[PDB]
Design an enzyme around this catalytic site. Sequence first.
Site, PDB file in Angstrom:
ATOM      1  N   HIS D  50       5.239  -7.989  -9.310  1.00  8.89           N
ATOM      2  CA  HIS D  50       5.746  -6.626  -9.290  1.00  8.89           C
ATOM      3  C   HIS D  50       5.240  -5.769 -10.462  1.00  8.89           C
ATOM      4  O   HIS D  50       5.989  -5.485 -11.394  1.00  8.89           O
ATOM      5  CB  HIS D  50       7.283  -6.694  -9.278  1.00  8.89           C
ATOM      6  CG  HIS D  50       7.960  -5.402  -8.938  1.00  8.89           C
ATOM      7  ND1 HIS D  50       8.041  -4.345  -9.821  1.00  8.89           N
ATOM      8  CD2 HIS D  50       8.597  -4.999  -7.812  1.00  8.89           C
ATOM      9  CE1 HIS D  50       8.700  -3.349  -9.253  1.00  8.89           C
ATOM     10  NE2 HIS D  50       9.048  -3.721  -8.033  1.00  8.89           N
ATOM     11  N   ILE D  56       5.703  -3.537 -13.564  1.00  6.43           N
ATOM     12  CA  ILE D  56       6.843  -2.614 -13.478  1.00  6.43           C
ATOM     13  C   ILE D  56       8.136  -3.424 -13.300  1.00  6.43           C
ATOM     14  O   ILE D  56       8.264  -4.191 -12.347  1.00  6.43           O
ATOM     15  CB  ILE D  56       6.738  -1.637 -12.276  1.00  6.43           C
ATOM     16  CG1 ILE D  56       5.437  -0.832 -12.328  1.00  6.43           C
ATOM     17  CG2 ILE D  56       7.939  -0.707 -12.277  1.00  6.43           C
ATOM     18  CD1 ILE D  56       5.290   0.050 -13.545  1.00  6.43           C
ATOM     19  N   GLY D  59      13.565  -1.924 -10.374  1.00  8.89           N
ATOM     20  CA  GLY D  59      14.742  -1.086 -10.502  1.00  8.89           C
ATOM     21  C   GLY D  59      16.035  -1.816 -10.168  1.00  8.89           C
ATOM     22  O   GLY D  59      17.045  -1.618 -10.848  1.00  8.89           O
ATOM     23  N   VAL D  60      16.020  -2.661  -9.136  1.00 11.42           N
ATOM     24  CA  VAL D  60      17.228  -3.385  -8.769  1.00 11.42           C
ATOM     25  C   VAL D  60      17.628  -4.361  -9.872  1.00 11.42           C
ATOM     26  O   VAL D  60      18.804  -4.659 -10.041  1.00 11.42           O
ATOM     27  CB  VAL D  60      17.080  -4.147  -7.404  1.00 11.42           C
ATOM     28  CG1 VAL D  60      16.860  -3.153  -6.282  1.00 11.42           C
ATOM     29  CG2 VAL D  60      15.938  -5.147  -7.460  1.00 11.42           C
ATOM     30  N   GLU D  64      21.044  -4.791 -11.938  1.00  8.21           N
ATOM     31  CA  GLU D  64      21.612  -6.113 -12.147  1.00  8.21           C
ATOM     32  C   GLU D  64      21.984  -6.297 -13.620  1.00  8.21           C
ATOM     33  O   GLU D  64      23.015  -6.882 -13.940  1.00  8.21           O
ATOM     34  CB  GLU D  64      20.592  -7.171 -11.707  1.00  8.21           C
ATOM     35  CG  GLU D  64      21.014  -8.626 -11.881  1.00  8.21           C
ATOM     36  CD  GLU D  64      22.333  -8.954 -11.202  1.00  8.21           C
ATOM     37  OE1 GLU D  64      22.639  -8.352 -10.153  1.00  8.21           O
ATOM     38  OE2 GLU D  64      23.057  -9.831 -11.718  1.00  8.21           O
TER      39      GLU D  64
HETATM   40  C1  LIG Z   1      10.900   7.067 -11.241  1.00 10.50           C
HETATM   41  O1  LIG Z   1      10.952   5.641 -11.363  1.00 10.50           O
HETATM   42  C2  LIG Z   1       9.760   5.104 -10.989  1.00 10.50           C
HETATM   43  C3  LIG Z   1       9.703   3.844 -10.404  1.00 10.50           C
HETATM   44  C4  LIG Z   1       8.480   3.293 -10.034  1.00 10.50           C
HETATM   45  C5  LIG Z   1       7.311   4.011 -10.257  1.00 10.50           C
HETATM   46  C6  LIG Z   1       5.931   3.436  -9.931  1.00 10.50           C
HETATM   47  O2  LIG Z   1       4.935   3.963 -10.425  1.00 10.50           O
HETATM   48  N1  LIG Z   1       5.899   2.362  -9.142  1.00 10.50           N
HETATM   49  N2  LIG Z   1       4.827   1.836  -8.839  1.00 10.50           N
HETATM   50  C7  LIG Z   1       3.694   2.344  -9.293  1.00 10.50           C
HETATM   51  C8  LIG Z   1       2.446   1.798  -9.014  1.00 10.50           C
HETATM   52  C9  LIG Z   1       2.326   0.595  -8.326  1.00 10.50           C
HETATM   53  C10 LIG Z   1       1.073   0.009  -8.184  1.00 10.50           C
HETATM   54 BR1  LIG Z   1       0.882  -1.672  -7.331  1.00 10.50          BR
HETATM   55  C11 LIG Z   1      -0.057   0.618  -8.715  1.00 10.50           C
HETATM   56  O3  LIG Z   1      -1.273   0.020  -8.596  1.00 10.50           O
HETATM   57  C12 LIG Z   1       0.063   1.827  -9.392  1.00 10.50           C
HETATM   58 BR2  LIG Z   1      -1.485   2.660 -10.098  1.00 10.50          BR
HETATM   59  C13 LIG Z   1       1.314   2.415  -9.539  1.00 10.50           C
HETATM   60  O4  LIG Z   1       1.429   3.610 -10.179  1.00 10.50           O
HETATM   61  C14 LIG Z   1       7.366   5.274 -10.835  1.00 10.50           C
HETATM   62  C15 LIG Z   1       8.589   5.823 -11.202  1.00 10.50           C
HETATM   63 CL   LIG Z   2      11.246  -0.885  -8.700  1.00  7.16          CL
END
Ligand SMILES: COc1ccc(C(=O)N/N=C/c2cc(Br)c(O)c(Br)c2O)cc1
Ligand SMILES: [Cl-]
Lengths: 151, 149, 149, 151, 149, 150
Positions: D50, D56, D59-60, D64
């Site tokens: 992830h 990253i 979020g869950v 938790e």
């Molecule tokens: C507002 O909270 C957030 C939660 C997740 C994100 C996020 O950027 N998630 N995933 C991003 C992401 C995943 C992959 Br796989 C990737 O190659 C790239 Br470039 C990303 O920006 C952004 C803001």
């Molecule tokens: Cl997430």
Amino acid sequence: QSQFFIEHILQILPHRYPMLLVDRITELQANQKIVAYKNITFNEDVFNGHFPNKPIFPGVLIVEGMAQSGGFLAFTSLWGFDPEIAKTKIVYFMTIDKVKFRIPVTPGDRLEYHLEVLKHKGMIWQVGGTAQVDGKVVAEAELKAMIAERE
Amino acid sequence: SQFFIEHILQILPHRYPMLLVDRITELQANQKIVAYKNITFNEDVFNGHFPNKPIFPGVLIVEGMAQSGGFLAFTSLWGFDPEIAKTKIVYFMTIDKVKFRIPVTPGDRLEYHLEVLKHKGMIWQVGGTAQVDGKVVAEAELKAMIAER
Amino acid sequence: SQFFIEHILQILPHRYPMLLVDRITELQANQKIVAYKNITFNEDVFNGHFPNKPIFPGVLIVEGMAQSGGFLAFTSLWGFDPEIAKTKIVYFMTIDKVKFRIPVTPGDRLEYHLEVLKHKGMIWQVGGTAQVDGKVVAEAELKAMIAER
Amino acid sequence: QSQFFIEHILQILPHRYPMLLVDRITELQANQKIVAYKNITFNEDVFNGHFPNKPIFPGVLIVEGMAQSGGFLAFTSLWGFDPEIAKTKIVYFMTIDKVKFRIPVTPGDRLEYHLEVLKHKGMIWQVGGTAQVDGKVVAEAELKAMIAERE
Amino acid sequence: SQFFIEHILQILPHRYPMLLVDRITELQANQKIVAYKNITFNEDVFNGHFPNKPIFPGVLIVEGMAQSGGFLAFTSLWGFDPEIAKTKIVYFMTIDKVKFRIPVTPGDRLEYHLEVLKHKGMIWQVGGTAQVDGKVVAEAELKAMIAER
Amino acid sequence: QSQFFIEHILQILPHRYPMLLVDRITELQANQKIVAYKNITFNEDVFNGHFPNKPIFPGVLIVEGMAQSGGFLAFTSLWGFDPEIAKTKIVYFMTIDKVKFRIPVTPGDRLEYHLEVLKHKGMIWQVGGTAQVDGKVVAEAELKAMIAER
Ligand SMILES: COc1ccc(C(=O)N/N=C/c2cc(Br)c(O)c(Br)c2O)cc1
Ligand SMILES: [Cl-]
Ligand SMILES: COc1ccc(C(=O)N/N=C/c2cc(Br)c(O)c(Br)c2O)cc1
Ligand SMILES: [Cl-]
Ligand SMILES: [Cl-]
Ligand SMILES: [Cl-]
Ligand SMILES: [Cl-]
Ligand SMILES: [Cl-]
């Protein structure tokens, strides 16, 4: 051509952690036999469950190791040492017979696989042999596996 | 006649990541046992078997059958007795006549069907099949021994 | 309308140990999806949740619904397109109305049922339940935004 | 009894690896609130999936962590630091509402949980708050938990 | 002068569970580097070091200092060049004068402070300390070599 | 008294997976020296990250394995094979010195630790030696530890 290390094994077998159970190859004869081994250490995840406070390398994984040894033999006998051809192949177990475990394998053991080709036809290889530790037969098995192009 | 994971845990010594039976659906002492293990992508074994192509290891199908047979053996010998179980472990003695017909993958409900072939003391020889949605996915015979840790 | 792990791996960026959907049983573009994940003791998460009492985390049940919902929103707009999938990222902005009614354990087939509540542009709101054998074990509402990766 | 380290947390929460998501507790006021945090490092198995090449924190899992903090608060508010009773009780989420993820959490971040007690009657606790990184709200949520018997 | 995990992954060859540097906070080519690794209970190492008493292994603190040095060494010679970095690995040649003064535990921000004592081609010699909340928890000197993968 | 297997090591050292880096003890001379070893196999988690496509047993873990062997030496010299007393003791390593790596360690290698007591003064123990694979020295190291109540 007769001796291969973990780097060479990684370029032939599709198996990966935690299922790549062959660490080194000592003897290799095309279409004939292979002698390889896997070191057994406490630092392996399977030992957390087999068994708590009593580390015993799973018998079925010994069989898996012999199969992988057979597979390495089968592949190189087929296309020689060719990582390019090997990277899109996989191996399937077809049958397993006459398996007998005689001595438990534990951390610290050098599990040596000895396999001889009993019969092969195209992609179907039937090998058989033993797994040894310090020269003693710890297990014996017979198996047939099929090399198949990743579809 | 349903034994759940917490029940299985009190009988079999196996633990993560080698406890390959999630639930027992049928049990008849000295006769047979039906059980199953769920197969999900979220299992470490799949990182290496194989990358980009998840295939539940044939040898682990057999292990699951052996464990099912083990539960059958433990209970047939001492009934559901957690006290006696905690001092025992199980060893694989022989494996034979195994054939894999269909690959088992994430999403499959791997069901074990084992019947007692012969037994005496701590030595149990069982045989049967592994099934997914009513189809035989694998056949196997095996003999295992129960022992004191 | 039925997708297997191989297909899922091509749409979702999630990998072990966070890819929580094993198979998709049905899908109607812009409307709904039914998918599931098998729960087995052979999962790393059970080592700590909890020792001697394996309970699939509730937040992971929600994570599984999210992944299903994202798969839904993505395929609705682009269908099964692995190539486009890599240029997109579905992340979740909010989660609401979550309720846990029954604990999920090894042996359970965790079925995700989500429907599109509303969608406008790249903002998709899905909601539904998590079911084990026809009974509702959890429910939740989620809102996702689809963006360029 | 306002600051607690991992050794104390281990005695109160039943969670273990890889689901114990609270490393330390900096502020704690019975029946009112708790401030705790979890260090986020690349050296965590979740990041393998992830996501590949893009770490990253789920979020869950942020939620938790807030819940575990809330649970510690609920328990200690009622029994104080009592390890013997802690192992006979367990907390479960009943509901979760108004979750908002504002900023992604990544390795190097110190995920700080700020939970406030909104309502509590007996074993039923309602808490709400935020998860913060360097003073900024990265997430928010409310949840109702139940302190139940372990057996 | 600061680099995040996305940057580190592009320069160092280490991956899980052996990439022990999370963020670079200060970097002066051919002179010094300050970086850190967050310590959390959620790390596999703690399952065995030790049960009910998590202590970050001293040898891993040195490993972290080495990795920081390696990052300094490489960006000093090629700057931020992901293409040339993927063709190299780092080799530990010697370790000297390491002292462990304070145990490192979950919740700690392990800060690496290294300065290059000497460097010649692919051979770099660094020395420094590891700090937690401004206190020295460890000291060490080490020589490493960047080599063609 | 001279040969201990994994079950015995488990009862003396507190280390557990994935940080128990000593598989078997081949020889032990109270207050003098210890020869032990840890098999190196690809089926170890550390190889996932050190390094991809190039498995190399971390140099620092060789030093850790040597430290563990030293600790077992120290402990057994003091109380012999006593699991019960083992549970009440701890040996922290205070320093590590003069370590040099000569040859990389890889899957398939039998990493053999050779430690000897360099000095024993009170609760302080200083041990040193080498790590060997097939008779060749792959690493050298000196380390000091302290015995203390758990
Ligand atoms: C507002 O909270 C957030 C939660 C997740 C994100 C996020 O950027 N998630 N995933 C991003 C992401 C995943 C992959 Br796989 C990737 O190659 C790239 Br470039 C990303 O920006 C952004 C803001
Ligand atoms: Cl997430
Ligand atoms: C409660 O379990 C503990 C075990 C070890 C410690 C510790 O901080 N360091 N090391 C302990 C230890 C024990 C032995 Br006997 C040994 O041979 C080595 Br080497 C150790 O590092 C603390 C608590
Ligand atoms: Cl076995
Ligand atoms: Cl197979
Ligand atoms: Cl839960
Ligand atoms: Cl240490
Ligand atoms: Cl190294």
